[PDB]
Design a protein around this ligand. Structure first.
Ligand SMILES: CCCCNC(=O)N1CCN(C(=O)c2cccs2)CC1
Length: 121
């Protein structure tokens, strides 16, 4: 399965599934500072799923590794902003992360295999 471009539609598909998940609701749009005015004192680089989807559709990811780095930043930002492990929004981030990781693993493997096949000779 050596299609070097297949990861893009696979990532679009996976973002559609993440948008259907009720657990994505807090992460679907950039954090609002009016409710969280301290947010940028804690978080250096905000990230959200709408920004990831727009970056993909603009043609501004070169690989699924780059997309994966931004999605992982959504989750590390939640983990750094939470005052406790027993946070509703943090617990939503941890279920959504498990779902994402379960689905992205084949996307990454197939892409990396395709690149290795391209440079086989
Ligand atoms: C505009 C619609 C929602 C935008 N998101 C939003 O406001 N937040 C989700 C991300 N976040 C957190 O990860 C945590 C809050 C408490 C524990 S972690 C801060 C709040």
């Amino acid at each position: 399965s050596y299609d070097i471009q297949a990861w893009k539609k696979q990532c679009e598909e996976l973002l559609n599934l993440i948008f259907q998940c009720e657990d994505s609701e807090p992460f679907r749009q950039p954090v609002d500072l009016l409710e969280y005015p301290d947010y940028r004192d804690i978080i250096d680089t905000p990230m959200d799923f709408a920004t990831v989807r727009e970056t993909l559709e603009a043609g501004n990811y070169e690989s699924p590794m780059e997309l994966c780095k931004d999605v992982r930043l959504i989750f590390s930002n939640s983990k750094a902003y939470t005052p406790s492990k027993r946070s509703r929004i943090y617990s939503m981030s941890l279920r959504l992360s498990a779902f994402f990781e379960e689905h992205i693993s084949s996307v990454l493997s197939d892409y990396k295999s395709a690149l290795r096949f391209h440079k086989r000779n």
